[PDB]
């Protein structure tokens, strides 16, 4: 099965934005994690 047409500039821009939104949740996990390791109180976590 192929693409009978070519995908319109704007619609593609939306699909790719969706795929870029995942970076946003990973940025929240990353931020929360740094704020954890930045109090040095976690015994479950370790860094070297």
């Amino acid at each position: 099965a192929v693409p009978k047409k070519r995908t319109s500039i704007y619609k593609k821009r939306i699909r790719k934005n969706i795929w870029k939104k995942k970076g946003y949740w990973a940025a929240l996990k990353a931020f929360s994690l740094a704020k954890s390791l930045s109090t040095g109180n976690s015994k479950s976590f370790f860094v070297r």
Binding site: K43, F46, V47, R48
Partner: protein
Amino acid sequence: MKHGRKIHRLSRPADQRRALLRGLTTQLLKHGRIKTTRAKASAMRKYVDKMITLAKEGSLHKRRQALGFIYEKQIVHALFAEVPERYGDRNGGYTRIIRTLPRRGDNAPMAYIELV
């Protein structure tokens, strides 16, 4: 599906997964702490403890059971030596699991399994 299938597959077939787990335990009992992947660690808990509980009784029977799990004799004998001393009062729970920054190459979540 799996409902109440509890085993850790580690994304390997039966043979390999066995051999892997045996290996990882002779490693943990040799070095006392190691760095692995979160799944491997969690899976390895059970077998670590099987070995320790094994050594706590000390019978020739048990010693032959452990010998036939761990790969290296020397580590087994040392186990049966140390364990009554070190773990005698501890009822269960012989391992600590401390997670770390994920790996660079694949971003697989890592971990530190400690003999506690």
